[PDB]
Write a structure and sequence with these properties.
The PDB classes it as ribosome. Keywords: translation, large ribosomal subunit, mitoribosome, mammalian mitochondrial ribosome, cryo-EM. This is part of a larger assembly, with chains A (200 residues), B (118 residues) and C (114 residues). Chain A has 5 helices and 9 strands; from the N terminus they run ββαββββαβαααββ. With 200 residues, chain A is an alpha+beta fold. Chain A has one domain. In chain A, β8 and β9 form a beta hairpin. Chain B has 118 residues and is of the alpha+beta class. In chain B, a hairpin with a 3-residue loop joins β4 and β5. In chain B, the strands form 2 sheets. A 3-stranded antiparallel beta sheet of chain B has the order 2-1-3, covered by helices on one side. A two-stranded antiparallel sheet of chain B has the order 4-5. Chain C has a single domain, classed as OB fold (Dihydrolipoamide Acetyltransferase, E2P). Helices cover 8% and strands 32% of the residues of chain C. In chain C, strands 1-3-6-5 form a 4-stranded antiparallel beta sheet, with no helix packed on it. In chain C, a hairpin with a 4-residue loop joins β5 and β6. The termini of chain C are far apart. The chains are: A alpha+beta (200), B alpha+beta (118), C mainly beta (114). Chains in contact: A-B, A-C. At the A-B interface, loops of A face loops of B. Bound molecules: magnesium ion (MG) (64 copies). The site of one magnesium ion (MG) has 2 residues of chain C, from loops. Chain C binds 3 RNA strands through β1, β3, β6 and β7.
RNA sequence: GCCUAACGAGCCUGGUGAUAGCUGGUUGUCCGAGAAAGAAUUUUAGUUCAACCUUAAAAAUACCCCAAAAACCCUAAAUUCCAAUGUAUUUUUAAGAGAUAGUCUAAAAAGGUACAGCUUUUUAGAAACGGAUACAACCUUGACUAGAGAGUAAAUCUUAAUACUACCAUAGUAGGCCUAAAAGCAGCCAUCAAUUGAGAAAGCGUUAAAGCUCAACAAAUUCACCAACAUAAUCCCAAAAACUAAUA
RNA sequence: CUGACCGUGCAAAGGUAGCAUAAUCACUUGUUCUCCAAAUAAGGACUUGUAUGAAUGGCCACACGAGGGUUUUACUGUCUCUUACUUCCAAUCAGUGAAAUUAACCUUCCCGUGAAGAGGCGGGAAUAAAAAAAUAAGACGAGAAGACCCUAUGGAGCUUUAAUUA
RNA sequence: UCGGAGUACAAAAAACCCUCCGAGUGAUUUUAAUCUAGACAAACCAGUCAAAAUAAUCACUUAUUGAUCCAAAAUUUUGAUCAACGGAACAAGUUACCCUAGGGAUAACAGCGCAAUCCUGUUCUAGAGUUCCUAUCGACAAUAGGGUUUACGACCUCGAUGUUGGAUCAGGACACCCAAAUGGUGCAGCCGCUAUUAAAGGUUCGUUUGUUCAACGAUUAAAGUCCUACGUGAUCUGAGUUCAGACCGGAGCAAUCCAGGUCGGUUUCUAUCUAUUAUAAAUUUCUCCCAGUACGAAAGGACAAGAGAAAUGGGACCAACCU
């Protein structure tokens, strides 16, 4: 059970970094113990109500003898602020309404190990995936590695001489004037919070 | 913010087939550039406008000649997306005094020293 | 609606701390080299230290920057202990500024031949 | 209230060209060069300084700028600083003002509702008589005067979405355990062993039975599977179009 | 359940006689009865009004209000739901003859756009030319340099413990 | 006003009624001096280091501070919550009795933007539904839309875009309240409850409130939800808000004041321009039957077909009646 509010509640309202939802993920990219997971195909903010859903659902859906689950995501640490209704702009920052975990595209939310075949987990994982803020998928190691090998196969099979990398890095057509500084790294595959898998 | 950017060296390392493709001679690099300005300096940052004032590229579609030394090459690199660059060729060799009046520059990027006899 | 924001006095001008002269700059005796609130750069050869931790040039010369070994004054205790607890292989390094004298010290002129 | 068709203080003539950091106006032609907000301020509808700039003058280097160099835990785009080099610009001296109530577009962030044709800074751009029909900010281009000449630039608007099929079903045994009953199929345990082939059972079903199908042979043929998303108020919004060859 | 009583605190005294949901902050269309087929109205009661209340007067009552409210009788074109007819205007003929207003107008409709509501722009529609009579949807119609709001180191009147004081 | 962090990641600079911590001085001893190169910083004023030549420290240490003039002082110097902190030698309330200059540089109305709130859908099945997820619903959640609400922005208008509710006349949407065809039912029939398709036509009269809303009486086949400058004031009405008078609570010492009640209170236009100034070719009830039959154990009880009557809405017309 994850706790609605942190045990040591943050006293000081923090600026909201959009940057921590933005682009590829570093942490929690690889499996540890389990065969299965729910993979995040966009960035997004996970608050308490979601944890509730994934928890009750995935607990009641699984055979406790043959299966076990694990959190790959922390319990929510980031304060979110509101102002009351009917507030004029200004006067200060508001007060703390919420707690959320930032989630970057390419991270595993839940890790399910067990002696089941991927068909079961995929059966009921697709529900919890379908119900998350970002677009999300139900995957295993074989699936993941397959789609990644395909993902670089596309980049070596690409028939048109022009890829986003080549242009953005060579600053051709002064394109760097329209692009962001984070655009060199994302290579134009991520845009804002969204992620496009077909972008080479 | 917006910035002066950079070009990483890999860009400027030519592949073997680029010689065959642009018809450059693999053994000997070429002496002079003919640089024409294709695009406008408006809507572009001030430092590019500067580079184009130094190169003498002031008005579009007029050719200029420049040395292939690294110093000029640097500036060209900064504005490389506004310009057209072609190697200058001298089939008849270098122009002498007598030929000064008869010089002509063809769109091949080719200088002809003896032009329109009689 | 009460709009009180409880925070006060964020506002100060900046102090323009930073490096005044750059490596290979010519300098006259008395120029301030850099000015910092904590030691970022320490004074090296021919660079004097002001009570506010300013670095000024003592000679006429060329300013040079350097990474050198740091051996704290045995009178200053904190630094002595910091030096003490290090593992036996490691030495401390810091950045220093220097002036490299240009003018020769003097000249011998022939005043009178008696 | 009323004091001669306007009384919170009469009317007239003086002071009186009262005084308006506030509106409103400011008259011939043609050429040069040309500006966007850092400070203080009963200041934020205003002034006065700096910076940019204009008009004269004196000079010497100015932008660009490779190594080298600028912090300590983690820390991107990038700055600062300098020869060579490409160019002609820059600094000082003497005079001057206006301006100091900005908009949007890209980028980095804040605040707000990861809302505004929203507000607040920092770095860039712009304000075509050509395109985006229309158009302030996006894109192509920078500029004069004549031609009943030419070459080009940005650009005209295209992109898609489907089916599920046989045939068949006995065995210990309603396995134990519980339980009103508990019979695969309320839950715990076991997962065994006949047949050639049929799970001590995946569905529904029954009070419990009973009964329907799935998995197993037998007969065949095989081709797939990753499916989709209601509407607004005067009256739809060029007309049309599969095709004579386009780096037009 | 309440509190005649009880304790302690503070005051210069601790709101009484009345009257009361009121021409009495709010709750609030308080509660209930009478009044009507039905009433947030009216009247009568209850009533802490926590912000009534006794010469800044409190309470009843004649007689009087072009004061405010409510019921009834009666009366009727107020209205169901309009009608007929006369007179002034009215329209045609003859005299005389003003007013605000007005960049120029050769002065359409739709849907988009746009300083964000178009007769003028864009894409479409429609379309001989002029009179007279009507109706008021538009011309952000006409009248008054908005009496609201805010801002001038603009005014004025009023009041006092504003500051200077004859 | 003054200083440390962040915002502002690596030279400097850098905003907010941005996020967070501090200072308007203590504690000592060692009394921390003159005079002059070169500098940082800087609109200015103020701020900073400092060689040579003569003979302060700790408290994150950085902030601990006020300019002229005028006063007092002695030999030379001290004087401020001048804290609105670049400092006026010393001045408060009110104004709905108000006045002028201006501003759409800035509010209230309306429009526009956005869609937090509000409003229609779908996607997911835990659950309700005795058993049964989806007849009727449905927590935690996903994704689209609509633009009427309360807000939020301040973009057009302050040399006027006159603002609530009615009256009259309505144009439009469909997210159907009736009428018309149908699917599903936990539908026997009668009622129902849900869903799909359909905008030619309808969508009442009263008592109390200024009231839209709401309650309540009586009915209807129904007595829709909305938009149109919360339609419509050069057509009408001002009860209400919203000026001047006045009371009553209250707040102020007062003047005056309270999106608190109460009584009272001027509604102006002769139409220049655009627009516009009559074709028709029905809609709905309720009866009468059927048949008290089909349907159900009975109690209750149909449509479809076919004859009648009305009513409303179009178009007319006076023999009678009534004016
Ligand atoms: Mg999702
Ligand atoms: Mg700071
Ligand atoms: Mg500052
Ligand atoms: Mg008079
Ligand atoms: Mg004057
Ligand atoms: Mg002052
Ligand atoms: Mg002013
Ligand atoms: Mg240089
Ligand atoms: Mg402004
Ligand atoms: Mg100004
Ligand atoms: Mg837009
Ligand atoms: Mg700029
Ligand atoms: Mg055009
Ligand atoms: Mg030209
Ligand atoms: Mg059996
Ligand atoms: Mg077997
Ligand atoms: Mg009493
Ligand atoms: Mg009251
Ligand atoms: Mg009292
Ligand atoms: Mg008295
Ligand atoms: Mg009294
Ligand atoms: Mg009497
Ligand atoms: Mg009288
Ligand atoms: Mg009377
Ligand atoms: Mg006449
Ligand atoms: Mg016309
Ligand atoms: Mg628009
Ligand atoms: Mg329009
Ligand atoms: Mg007439
Ligand atoms: Mg009209
Ligand atoms: Mg007009
Ligand atoms: Mg109007
Ligand atoms: Mg005005
Ligand atoms: Mg004033
Ligand atoms: Mg004044
Ligand atoms: Mg010394
Ligand atoms: Mg003093
Ligand atoms: Mg001040
Ligand atoms: Mg000040
Ligand atoms: Mg200052
Ligand atoms: Mg009054
Ligand atoms: Mg006025
Ligand atoms: Mg405005
Ligand atoms: Mg209006
Ligand atoms: Mg508004
Ligand atoms: Mg408007
Ligand atoms: Mg929306
Ligand atoms: Mg909003
Ligand atoms: Mg603004
Ligand atoms: Mg106005
Ligand atoms: Mg006007
Ligand atoms: Mg209508
Ligand atoms: Mg429908
Ligand atoms: Mg209708
Ligand atoms: Mg209205
Ligand atoms: Mg009205
Ligand atoms: Mg009107
Ligand atoms: Mg009173
Ligand atoms: Mg009267
Ligand atoms: Mg009144
Ligand atoms: Mg009128
Ligand atoms: Mg007419
Ligand atoms: Mg008329
Ligand atoms: Mg009729």
């Amino acid at each position: 059970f994850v706790e609605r509010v942190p045990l040591v509640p943050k006293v000081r309202r923090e600026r909201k970094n959009l940057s921590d939802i933005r682009g590829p993920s570093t942490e929690a990219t690889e499996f540890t113990e389990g065969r299965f997971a729910i993979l995040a195909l966009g960035g997004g903010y996970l608050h308490w109500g979601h944890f509730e859903m994934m928890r009750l659902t995935i607990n009641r859906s699984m055979d406790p003898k043959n299966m076990f689950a694990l959190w790959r995501v922390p319990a929510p640490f980031k304060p979110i602020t509101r102002k009351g209704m009917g507030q004029r702009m200004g006067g200060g920052k508001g007060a703390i309404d919420h707690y959320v975990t930032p989630v970057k595209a390419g991270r595993l939310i839940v890790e399910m190990g067990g002696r089941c075949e991927f068909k079961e987990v995929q059966g009921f994982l697709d529900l919890v995936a379908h119900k998350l803020p970002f677009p999300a998928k139900a995957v295993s190691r074989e699936t993941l590695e397959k789609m990644r090998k395909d993902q670089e196969e596309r980049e070596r099979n690409n028939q048109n001489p022009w890829t986003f990398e080549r242009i953005a890095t060579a600053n051709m057509l002064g394109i760097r004037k329209v692009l962001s500084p984070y655009d060199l790294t994302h290579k134009g595959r991520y845009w804002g919070k969204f992620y496009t898998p077909e972008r080479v | 913010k917006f910035t002066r950017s950079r070009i990483p060296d890999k860009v400027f390392q030519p592949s073997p087939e680029d010689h065959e493709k642009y018809g450059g001679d693999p053994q000997y690099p070429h002496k002079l550039h003919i640089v024409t300005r294709i695009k406008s300096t408006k809507r572009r940052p001030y430092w590019e406008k500067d580079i184009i004032k130094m190169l003498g590229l002031e008005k579009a579609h007029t050719p200029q000649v420049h040395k292939n030394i690294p110093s000029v090459n640097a500036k060209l690199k900064v504005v490389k997306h506004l310009i057209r660059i072609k190697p200058l060729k001298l089939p008849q060799g270098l122009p002498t005094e007598e030929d000064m009046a008869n010089t002509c520059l063809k769109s091949n990027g080719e200088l002809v020293v003896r032009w329109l006899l009689n | 609606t009460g709009g009180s924001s409880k925070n006060l006095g964020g506002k100060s001008p900046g102090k323009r701390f930073g490096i005044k002269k750059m490596e290979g700059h010519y300098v006259h005796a008395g120029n301030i080299l850099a000015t910092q609130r904590h030691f970022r750069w320490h004074p090296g050869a021919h660079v004097g230290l002001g009570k506010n931790k300013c670095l000024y040039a003592l000679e006429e010369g060329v300013v040079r920057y350097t990474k050198e070994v740091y051996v704290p004054n045995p009178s200053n205790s904190e630094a002595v202990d910091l030096v003490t607890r290090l593992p036996q292989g490691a030495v401390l390094y810091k950045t220093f500024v220097h002036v490299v004298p240009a003018k020769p010290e003097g000249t011998f002129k022939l005043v009178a031949m008696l």
